Amino acid sequence: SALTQPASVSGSPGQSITISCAGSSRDVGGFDLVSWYQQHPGKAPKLIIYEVNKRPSGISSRFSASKSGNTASLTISGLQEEDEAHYYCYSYADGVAFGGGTKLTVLGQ
Amino acid sequence: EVQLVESGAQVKKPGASVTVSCTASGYKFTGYHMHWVRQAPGRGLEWMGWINPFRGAVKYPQNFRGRVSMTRDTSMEIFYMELSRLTSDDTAVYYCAREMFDSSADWSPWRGMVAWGQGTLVTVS
Amino acid sequence: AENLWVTVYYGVPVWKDAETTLFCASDAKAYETEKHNVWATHACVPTDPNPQEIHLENVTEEFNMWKNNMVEQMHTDIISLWDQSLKPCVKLTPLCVTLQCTNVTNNITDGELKNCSFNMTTELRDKKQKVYSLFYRLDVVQINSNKEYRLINCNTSAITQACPKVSFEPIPIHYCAPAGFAILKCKDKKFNGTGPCPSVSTVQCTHGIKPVVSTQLLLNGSLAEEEVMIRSENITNNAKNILVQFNTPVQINCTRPNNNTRKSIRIGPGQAFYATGDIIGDIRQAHCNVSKATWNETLGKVVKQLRKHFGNNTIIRFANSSGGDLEVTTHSFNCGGEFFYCNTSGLFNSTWISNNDSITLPCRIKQIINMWQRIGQAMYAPPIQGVIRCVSNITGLILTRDGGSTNSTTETFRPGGGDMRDNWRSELYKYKVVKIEPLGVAPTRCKRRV
Amino acid sequence: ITDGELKNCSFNMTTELRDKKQKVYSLFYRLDVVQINSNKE
Amino acid sequence: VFLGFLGAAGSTMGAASMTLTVQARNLLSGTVWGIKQLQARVLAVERYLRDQQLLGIWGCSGKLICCTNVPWNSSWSNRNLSEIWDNMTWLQWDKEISNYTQIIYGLLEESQNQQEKNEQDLLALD
């Protein structure tokens, strides 16, 4: 593949979530180029965050991301069903790094 | 507002290749990098190639070069791509998407897919 | 006594970073190649008989060849000599009358071109004119009985024929500056680009530059100093254009062994259209005899400058351009007033191990061009009477690189990019514009009168 | 009805190709056109 | 040893105040495909007449060197004299005044010739 996404993630209706995106100092540490996404299972996506932490005009203020060295993150607080979607990341890497697919399930088993 | 509009649905048999497009309007076509990426339902997105519409520069991975040929038109205003040599493991919903920071002189980067097509489905069995 | 003042000086060696406009200079001599102002040398003013270069010790100005505002100033010139040798010639919208084309008069062995024919007007208004020409199957395309054709631009652009007087041979031009502005030159050998250059030199007129319409490679250009220049704004970004500048020229023998006849078609009054006269006898397509000895020579030089960029024991691949229009995939260059594209697949293909004849390249011909994508103003390149042998110094190269793939085990490389701002930059990589601030101050013990 | 002040006006016109002619109708306001001196043209 | 134009680039301020008639002499120096010349030269005397303008309003007029009657306001980075003329260059000097020369320059003109030349019409009359 070309991007380290987690196997499966989970969250509850009425709470909150956040995701870690970790790498090396050659990909995230030195290049201000990290963008984030949200997409309902099978729908048209739309850019959530670009350049570490900037949203397009039309994206909710409930979204905001970060870059801490080699460990970047996006954070969502106050979960609604607006967020019952699959989640992806993106990172600077020569040509392009592409993620492997993080499935949103229910944790507890 | 500007849009990226793809075609409908096409179903095929093994040993084939499919015409899938994504036209554009609302801006000056010549300066927008464009990618073809494919998604598995609820899984992830895998990259196959990108295009510089300024004279047509394209590039693929290495499980694709030779299979993928990819082009556009600058006055008919449309993007194309055709992945050749189809197996039953090449079914996906293919998305055209444009980068965040292009221009007509300097370049960078690889980020930010704001405008998305609706997704074109290709099936092989 | 001990209460300091301020003292004013004029003509202090001081400068800053600022961008502005230059002017052309082609000596008192280039005017005499004539051909009714080849390219651009007409009203432009002759050069001063000695371009004074002054070397600077202990000067570390921070340079920039990429965001350099002169690489863009250069790209704008080729459009206006066009326009001011375009708007006053023959506009050719009557040329979008349907054509009848066919594989030419041969023993078949197919044919790339077509023996066409179609309808036009003449000196008189009522009466008109049919006349036949020969077009490359690239210049034309079908439409719907036999196969019927029409010109390729008519579904995009109206067309204006150029004038055969103005020759499109790229003509050298010096870039010169006036008072308050000047030009830096980082003549240094091992110059890595970004930032301070320890041995700056300054000039009024740059070394002469040729506006060669050349993608991928560069011809008739500027050789490097010492090692081979290998530049890229971001080598870890394959969308960044990577450009080469050799110190050694590779020989090329481009030609087009055809005696062309210029049919003078009256479609005005006045306006004279040129049709492909009956090409003389035996049929051969344009080519270039490239000295394979000189080709593989500069090949081994640069390749060995690249294993230093990746570990210690590696595997390095080479292939042709992964895709692009003729300017990108092929080697594009003007050759005598016409345009050649020589299929660079016969250049990029190799792998060697750890312990007389000539390659030659197949070249296509393109006359109808919508170049500069100025939709609203496309043109026709007039035909050239005379076989066009053309030698030049193969000077540069434009290429990119693949993506992720399987790591360490290998990684591949191929030409591309195309965008001419690099080819233009290969002639301006060592220059930087500054402005002079001749006022200087200091606190001495000096007082005037009150 | 529920009225017209505008018309549905068909006409022929020279297209990209010099030989091909084109059918197309437009709509204009009563100020952009004028009758010259049966239906009206 | 005649080092050229701005050849005293990275040399001491004292030595670099010698050739004051070298970076000021050639600051004036005595259709299409022609717009280029007639455009660029409109900038030559704009960044030269500015100097023929400013010397006149200071205690200068007479070209090259000319002193002032103004307090060096010691809020500026004042330094020892044997650490200025003896050792500094005209390229290291101007980098210091950068952050505040827009506050600095409001004096020679606003103070000296606004008053030191109004001590001359508090001189010559009665």
PDB file of C-alpha atoms in Angstrom, chain B residues 30-123:
ATOM      1  CA  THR B  30      -6.075  24.425 -18.992  1.00  0.00           C
ATOM      2  CA  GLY B  31      -4.801  24.877 -15.447  1.00  0.00           C
ATOM      3  CA  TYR B  32      -6.346  22.116 -13.310  1.00  0.00           C
ATOM      4  CA  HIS B  33      -4.470  18.936 -12.457  1.00  0.00           C
ATOM      5  CA  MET B  34      -6.818  15.958 -12.291  1.00  0.00           C
ATOM      6  CA  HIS B  35      -6.632  12.459 -10.806  1.00  0.00           C
ATOM      7  CA  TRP B  36      -8.428   9.166 -11.358  1.00  0.00           C
ATOM      8  CA  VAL B  37      -8.785   7.271  -8.072  1.00  0.00           C
ATOM      9  CA  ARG B  38     -10.910   4.193  -7.387  1.00  0.00           C
ATOM     10  CA  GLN B  39     -12.787   3.303  -4.202  1.00  0.00           C
ATOM     11  CA  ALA B  40     -14.020  -0.055  -2.942  1.00  0.00           C
ATOM     12  CA  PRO B  41     -17.422   0.204  -1.208  1.00  0.00           C
ATOM     13  CA  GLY B  42     -16.756   1.355   2.346  1.00  0.00           C
ATOM     14  CA  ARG B  43     -13.063   0.472   2.037  1.00  0.00           C
ATOM     15  CA  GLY B  44     -10.363   2.835   0.772  1.00  0.00           C
ATOM     16  CA  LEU B  45      -9.212   4.629  -2.359  1.00  0.00           C
ATOM     17  CA  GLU B  46      -6.383   3.407  -4.606  1.00  0.00           C
ATOM     18  CA  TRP B  47      -4.523   5.630  -7.068  1.00  0.00           C
ATOM     19  CA  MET B  48      -3.954   4.841 -10.747  1.00  0.00           C
ATOM     20  CA  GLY B  49      -2.829   8.059 -12.436  1.00  0.00           C
ATOM     21  CA  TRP B  50      -2.967  11.835 -12.780  1.00  0.00           C
ATOM     22  CA  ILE B  51      -2.901  14.308 -15.662  1.00  0.00           C
ATOM     23  CA  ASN B  52      -1.478  17.761 -16.326  1.00  0.00           C
ATOM     24  CA  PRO B  53      -3.917  19.186 -18.921  1.00  0.00           C
ATOM     25  CA  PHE B  54      -1.162  21.521 -20.182  1.00  0.00           C
ATOM     26  CA  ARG B  55      -0.035  19.256 -23.063  1.00  0.00           C
ATOM     27  CA  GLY B  56      -1.111  16.050 -21.352  1.00  0.00           C
ATOM     28  CA  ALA B  57       1.590  14.842 -18.954  1.00  0.00           C
ATOM     29  CA  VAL B  58       0.468  11.694 -17.112  1.00  0.00           C
ATOM     30  CA  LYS B  59       1.981   9.172 -14.701  1.00  0.00           C
ATOM     31  CA  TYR B  60       0.873   5.889 -13.105  1.00  0.00           C
ATOM     32  CA  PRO B  61       2.096   3.382 -10.494  1.00  0.00           C
ATOM     33  CA  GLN B  62       3.912   0.219 -11.603  1.00  0.00           C
ATOM     34  CA  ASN B  63       0.995  -2.221 -11.347  1.00  0.00           C
ATOM     35  CA  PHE B  64      -0.668   0.039 -13.954  1.00  0.00           C
ATOM     36  CA  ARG B  65       1.812   1.554 -16.457  1.00  0.00           C
ATOM     37  CA  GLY B  66       0.981  -0.039 -19.791  1.00  0.00           C
ATOM     38  CA  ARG B  67      -2.508  -0.952 -18.640  1.00  0.00           C
ATOM     39  CA  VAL B  68      -3.568   2.654 -17.992  1.00  0.00           C
ATOM     40  CA  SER B  69      -3.641   5.210 -20.782  1.00  0.00           C
ATOM     41  CA  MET B  70      -5.135   8.548 -19.927  1.00  0.00           C
ATOM     42  CA  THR B  71      -5.843  11.838 -21.702  1.00  0.00           C
ATOM     43  CA  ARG B  72      -8.169  14.844 -22.047  1.00  0.00           C
ATOM     44  CA  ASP B  73      -9.298  17.542 -24.482  1.00  0.00           C
ATOM     45  CA  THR B  74      -8.739  21.275 -24.018  1.00  0.00           C
ATOM     46  CA  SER B  75     -11.508  22.813 -26.160  1.00  0.00           C
ATOM     47  CA  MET B  76     -14.071  20.024 -25.975  1.00  0.00           C
ATOM     48  CA  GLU B  77     -13.307  20.339 -22.223  1.00  0.00           C
ATOM     49  CA  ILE B  78     -13.309  16.797 -20.856  1.00  0.00           C
ATOM     50  CA  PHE B  79     -11.045  14.285 -19.100  1.00  0.00           C
ATOM     51  CA  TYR B  80     -10.753  10.607 -20.077  1.00  0.00           C
ATOM     52  CA  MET B  81      -9.105   7.431 -18.826  1.00  0.00           C
ATOM     53  CA  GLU B  82      -9.223   3.738 -19.714  1.00  0.00           C
ATOM     54  CA  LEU B  83      -7.601   1.053 -17.574  1.00  0.00           C
ATOM     55  CA  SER B  84      -6.940  -1.822 -19.967  1.00  0.00           C
ATOM     56  CA  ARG B  85      -6.635  -5.554 -19.223  1.00  0.00           C
ATOM     57  CA  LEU B  86      -9.598  -6.069 -16.884  1.00  0.00           C
ATOM     58  CA  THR B  87      -9.928  -8.994 -14.484  1.00  0.00           C
ATOM     59  CA  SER B  88     -12.700  -9.838 -12.041  1.00  0.00           C
ATOM     60  CA  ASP B  89     -10.558  -8.121  -9.373  1.00  0.00           C
ATOM     61  CA  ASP B  90     -10.670  -4.657 -11.006  1.00  0.00           C
ATOM     62  CA  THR B  91     -14.247  -3.651 -10.114  1.00  0.00           C
ATOM     63  CA  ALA B  92     -14.531  -0.259  -8.405  1.00  0.00           C
ATOM     64  CA  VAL B  93     -16.282   3.108  -8.314  1.00  0.00           C
ATOM     65  CA  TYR B  94     -13.870   5.470 -10.074  1.00  0.00           C
ATOM     66  CA  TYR B  95     -13.697   9.135  -9.037  1.00  0.00           C
ATOM     67  CA  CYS B  96     -12.262  12.124 -10.829  1.00  0.00           C
ATOM     68  CA  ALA B  97     -10.999  14.763  -8.417  1.00  0.00           C
ATOM     69  CA  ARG B  98      -8.972  17.949  -8.721  1.00  0.00           C
ATOM     70  CA  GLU B  99      -6.066  19.117  -6.580  1.00  0.00           C
ATOM     71  CA  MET B 100      -6.024  22.120  -4.244  1.00  0.00           C
ATOM     72  CA  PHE B 101      -3.041  24.202  -5.434  1.00  0.00           C
ATOM     73  CA  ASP B 102      -2.346  24.237  -9.173  1.00  0.00           C
ATOM     74  CA  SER B 103      -1.314  27.163 -11.363  1.00  0.00           C
ATOM     75  CA  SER B 104       0.182  27.938 -14.768  1.00  0.00           C
ATOM     76  CA  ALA B 105       3.843  28.422 -13.758  1.00  0.00           C
ATOM     77  CA  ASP B 106       5.225  26.930 -10.548  1.00  0.00           C
ATOM     78  CA  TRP B 107       3.580  23.886  -9.044  1.00  0.00           C
ATOM     79  CA  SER B 108       3.276  21.798  -5.883  1.00  0.00           C
ATOM     80  CA  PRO B 109       1.578  19.919  -4.136  1.00  0.00           C
ATOM     81  CA  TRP B 110      -0.613  16.826  -3.990  1.00  0.00           C
ATOM     82  CA  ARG B 111      -3.299  17.930  -1.523  1.00  0.00           C
ATOM     83  CA  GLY B 112      -6.942  18.874  -1.131  1.00  0.00           C
ATOM     84  CA  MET B 113      -9.718  17.308  -3.215  1.00  0.00           C
ATOM     85  CA  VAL B 114     -12.575  19.782  -2.801  1.00  0.00           C
ATOM     86  CA  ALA B 115     -14.586  19.169  -5.972  1.00  0.00           C
ATOM     87  CA  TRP B 116     -15.652  15.557  -6.519  1.00  0.00           C
ATOM     88  CA  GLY B 117     -17.545  13.734  -9.221  1.00  0.00           C
ATOM     89  CA  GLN B 118     -20.491  11.527  -8.361  1.00  0.00           C
ATOM     90  CA  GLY B 119     -18.596   8.298  -9.075  1.00  0.00           C
ATOM     91  CA  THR B 120     -18.719   5.986 -12.096  1.00  0.00           C
ATOM     92  CA  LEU B 121     -19.214   2.257 -11.518  1.00  0.00           C
ATOM     93  CA  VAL B 122     -17.420  -0.429 -13.550  1.00  0.00           C
ATOM     94  CA  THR B 123     -18.112  -4.138 -12.997  1.00  0.00           C
TER      95      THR B 123
END
